[PDB]
Amino acid sequence: GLXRKXLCAXAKKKXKCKXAXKLXCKC
Incomplete structure (x- = not known):
């Protein structure tokens, strides 16, 4: 993978x- x-x-x-945004990417 890249x-x-x-x-x-x-x-x-x-x-x-x-489930946490600033913690985040694609999940």
């Missing part, structure tokens, strides 16, 4: 996707 879309799939998967 960089920010690596970081985004990081956000979706350390479990940082708590």
Whole structure:
């Protein structure tokens, strides 16, 4: 996968996707 879309799939998967915007990307 691409960089920010690596970081985004990081956000979706350390479990940082708590439903929270400024925390956010695609989740």
